[PDB]
């Protein structure tokens, strides 16, 4: 396992622009579009990403594009964030891609204000940072990933994706 193939099950994959759990226009694995209810808006926004007129539809490998795109636009948010860089300089590599998932999520300012529990992970209280990620709006609207996320920091292992 690797982020690319975390990201990938807890994204999917759809070559049309859909909504996302929260109702926003987005296309490929998780690339977000735009919040405007708009659907013309998010085709603008779409043509803009890729280069093209794409009317709604892209390829694999142009979701594939964004989706390399959108990984490091999440790792170079956590290097330059002050909150977020020493927590996931001081992590193990598997806890890392469980942080580069939740900023791939809901963006580096959102994962920067986790305050309490960033700290019990910068010092390795794995139970209770569990405990503290849980109680959370993220959580509560998408617990199915949040629990495998949330596994991910607690135990420092794959288990709960490695049969997905």
């Known amino acids: 396992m690797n982020i690319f193939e975390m990201l990938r099950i807890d994204e999917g994959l759809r070559l049309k622009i859909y909504k996302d759990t929260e ?8 690339h977000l579009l ?13 043509d803009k990403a890729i280069g093209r007129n794409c009317n709604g539809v892209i390829t694999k490998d142009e979701a594939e594009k964004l989706f390399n795109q ?10 330059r964030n002050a909150k977020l860089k020493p927590v996931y300089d001081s992590l193990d590599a598997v806890r890392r891609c469980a942080a580069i998932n ?22 390795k209280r794995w139970d209770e940072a569990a405990v503290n990620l849980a ?30």
């Open 23 to 30: 109702g926003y226009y987005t296309i490929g694995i998780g």
């Open 34 to 46: 735009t919040k405007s209810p708009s659907l013309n808006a998010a085709k603008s926004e779409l």
């Open 70 to 79: 959108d990984v490091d636009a999440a790792v170079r948010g956590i290097l």
């Open 102 to 123: 939740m900023v791939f999520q809901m963006g580096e300012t959102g994962v920067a204000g986790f305050t309490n529990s960033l700290r019990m992970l910068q010092q």
């Open 135 to 164: 109680k959370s709006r993220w959580y509560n609207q998408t617990p199915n990933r949040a629990k495998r996320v949330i596994t991910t920091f607690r135990t420092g292992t794959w288990d709960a994706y490695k049969n997905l």
